[PDB]
Automatic annotation (TrEMBL), chains A, C, D:
Keywords: Plasmid. This is Uncharacterized protein. It comes from the Bacteria. The chain holds residues 53 to 163 of 230 of the full protein.
Automatic annotation (TrEMBL), chain B:
The chain holds residues 52 to 102 of 407 of the full protein. This is Phage portal protein.
Length: 111, 51, 111, 111, 97, 97
């Protein structure tokens, strides 16, 4: 292990920690977006408090809020053509991110 | 510098009509639009970057 | 015997390769569908003939057509929210397939 | 002991992961109120996208947004009193948190 | 230790296959070929499983397929993935039955 | 000296736990298992506490749940993290009772 190896290992470690920090901040902003969308566009019964009392994981809460927002805003033809199926019960993931983006811009154009 | 140049372009556009109104009427008004609501125009401004 | 059953496994792997040939054919069908989209919704300057004359690979032509279609139909707000970035210049792949699906949905709803 | 001991040590690991998750939720709340203030009350030029393109750490982005919000809402006399100096360029921290709380109070009473 | 982890994975896979075979064989063939009574008669587990598989073939897979695909009428010595083919054909037969 | 301070903190924690267990056990199980009579019979303090805990499990936690979490019907030798789980289960059962 020479000086160049020491420097490259140190830089790689620093960059990895910086990327982890950025990922934590991104998760923070995602939690924000779920909270605000649930408060503004969805009923009080879908609040994180009552869902946690019913015993659902945080990720389950996020995806349930996302699916409800998509059904509320995004039309059924748009769902059937984005996700290739009508049912959203098994479309959590990147395609769910697409549907929620479509709803996010749907509410913008609705306003 | 790009945002500041766009601000300068809008400032020139406003200043032309400001000088024209100054010569024709005797006074000219240019509103400095910031990121605020229509009701917030009454409130004073301490430090802000105009839109 | 053991030879009979191992050759059975061999030709079953050949059968899997046949299925790979089929999915290649399906990919080619997707390619011609993207070509139809490009002709229908994009300028004549982005034709495969002129792009090949300028010296671009076929995959490069397809991804350029897909990126242009996404920018044309999918609004920039969805583009940013989906790719997590505004620029599409380095988003070729499964995310690009999702984006061109969204573009197909956009033209369908536009009609 | 033994088998159950290691499984309960994995349970302690679960406790650690839950502590990390709660810390992430706290990050969510703080950084997210900050981002809501930034979007609602500050110019488009101070967006996270353009600031990151200019090459600033996200912590730098948050402290810049907080400083701009404090200058926009909190009066200079209040800054000179609470922070003991007029310049906010070196007041990032708990004093900055107090200043942004005062700015939130200011916008609440302004509305 | 991941080598032993994968060994345990393979153990789980064969255990699941044995589970499926047993849950169908007890309800299809007889109680005389139960694991307990076969062990009492003195057969190893692999011998028990292969004997049950051969009985499954003799029950579902017809003799013409036995003497054509497996090339021998007697399933006494055909064991291998040819026996795998035979038990797959028996699974298809019980599915259509 | 802060090491001894933290040792005293842990001492207070376990003393409070012992006091709570004894207070609930006196009103729930019997007075035959009182600390004084058990000490007279010749059991150490930790042995008294673990015996009271096992009796609390055997009272509130029914034997089915006992063998479910303890993984053995007899609580005679399950002591440890499993025993703590069982006594918390006893606390839960008396809370819902």
């Amino acid at each position: 292990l020479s000086i160049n190896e020491r420097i490259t290992k140190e830089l790689a470690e620093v960059e990895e920690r910086e990327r982890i920090e950025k990922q934590l901040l991104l998760e923070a902003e995602r939690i924000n977006e779920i909270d605000t969308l649930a408060k503004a566009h969805l009923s009080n019964h879908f609040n994180k408090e009552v869902l946690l009392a019913k015993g659902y994981t945080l990720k389950d809460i996020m995806q349930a809020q996302r699916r409800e927002l998509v059904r509320k805003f995004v039309p059924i033809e748009q769902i059937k053509a984005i996700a290739k199926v009508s049912d959203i019960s098994h479309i959590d993931g990147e395609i769910l991110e697409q549907l929620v983006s479509l709803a996010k811009v749907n509410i913008k154009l609705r306003k | 510098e790009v945002e500041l140049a766009r601000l300068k372009v809008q400032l020139k556009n406003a200043l032309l009509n400001c000088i024209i109104s100054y010569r024709f009427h005797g006074i000219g008004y240019v509103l400095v639009k910031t990121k605020d609501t229509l009701i917030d125009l009454e409130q004073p401004v301490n430090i802000e970057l105009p839109i």
